[PDB]
Design a protein around this ligand. Structure first.
Ligand SMILES: [Zn+2]
Lengths: 299, 35
């Protein structure tokens, strides 16, 4: 259903609203903010129960990473339309899922430039766009972030200069204390990463996050056999200071903060053909559910 | 269209002049795009 094609941002929002109409006692669809160009950045809250641990999942902060919102939508479909098959992650866990963080870039990638990455807000002439995953206010503007407005990793004019990242900030801040698992979906590379993105040194509680990441990689290995490399983002992939996972872990005090690089496909890596969507999201959901189950089992 | 893609690298400078695969992936040790 949601894994047969790449949905446009408007179609994604209508799907969320339809689920709100169809499952009002299970889900609530809320607007977390407005993009720079005026698009509604929506989230869906699944199984809201008082005192529950909260899993916050976002995707599509980078425009060209189409498989990340597709995986997030597939996770929504499994949890909402097939809740009877996912009771283990629907008892003490509450899900807040933001399928698209950067709708302006995402729509731009569909219409104008397939491999656009940043947002679409002008940066002060001659270039548009800010790297959303370099725009969070924790070690902002440091190694792995560029001061040049035209670079792929432009940190932005200031920290949280983009309304898209402010929407993520406000949604996670509203769940401070209750949010125990922050998951940010990216593509590509087959990685499950955690802080830090500003140094190669590991956080004090890196083992706890590593165990959650190991569970996701192990479940995928048992299910499909695909390999996911686990480690800190700086050590495994590259330095990425200003990322959302670092900010959620350190500022929002989310104990388990993970960035996931979903499988690549096509000639550019970011563009698997629509026929490949179903297999990729199915495999990715196996890992995502396993990490959430590991989080739920902590209590 | 980017010949620097999948070029072996130790640091980001080995991926200079790439325009798409500007990042040196640490585990892969090859030039790739920002993901
Ligand atoms: Zn990304």
């Amino acid at each position: 259903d949601v894994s047969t094609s790449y949905l446009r941002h408007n179609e994604i929002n209508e799907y969320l609203q339809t689920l709100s109409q169809k499952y009002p006692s299970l889900v609530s669809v809320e607007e977390a903010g407005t993009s720079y160009e005026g698009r509604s950045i929506k989230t869906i809250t699944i199984n809201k129960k008082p005192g529950n641990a909260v899993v916050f999942l976002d995707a599509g902060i980078h425009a060209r990473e189409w498989i990340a919102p597709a995986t997030a939508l597939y996770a929504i479909e499994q949890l909402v339309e097939h809740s009877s098959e996912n009771q283990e992650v629907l008892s003490n866990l509450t899900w807040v899922i933001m399928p698209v963080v950067n709708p302006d870039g995402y729509e731009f990638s569909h219409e104008t430039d397939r491999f656009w990455r940043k947002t679409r807000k002008p940066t002060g002439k001659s270039c548009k766009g800010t790297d959303g995953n370099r725009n969070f206010d924790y070690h902002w503007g440091e190694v792995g972030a560029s001061t040049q407005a035209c670079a792929d990793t432009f940190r932005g004019e200031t920290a949280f200069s983009e309304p898209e990242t402010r929407a993520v900030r406000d949604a996670v801040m509203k769940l401070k204390g209750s949010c125990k698992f922050y998951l940010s979906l990216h593509s590509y590379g087959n990685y499950i990463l955690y802080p830090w993105g500003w140094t190669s040194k590991l956080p004090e509680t890196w083992e706890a996050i590593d165990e959650v990441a190991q569970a996701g990689a192990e479940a995928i290995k048992q299910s499909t056999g695909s390999r996911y490399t686990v480690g800190s983002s700086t050590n495994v992939l590259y330095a990425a200071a200003g990322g959302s996972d670092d900010w959620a872990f350190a500022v929002a005090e989310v104990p388990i903060s993970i960035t996931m690089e979903l499988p690549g496909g096509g000639n550019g890596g970011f563009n698997p053909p629509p026929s490949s969507i179903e297999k990729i999201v199915n495999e990715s959901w196996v890992g995502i559910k396993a990490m959430a189950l590991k989080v739920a089992q902590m209590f | 269209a980017d010949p620097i893609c999948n070029k072996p690298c130790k640091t980001h400078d080995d991926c200079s002049g790439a325009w798409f695969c500007q990042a040196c992936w640490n585990s892969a040790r090859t030039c790739g795009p920002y993901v």
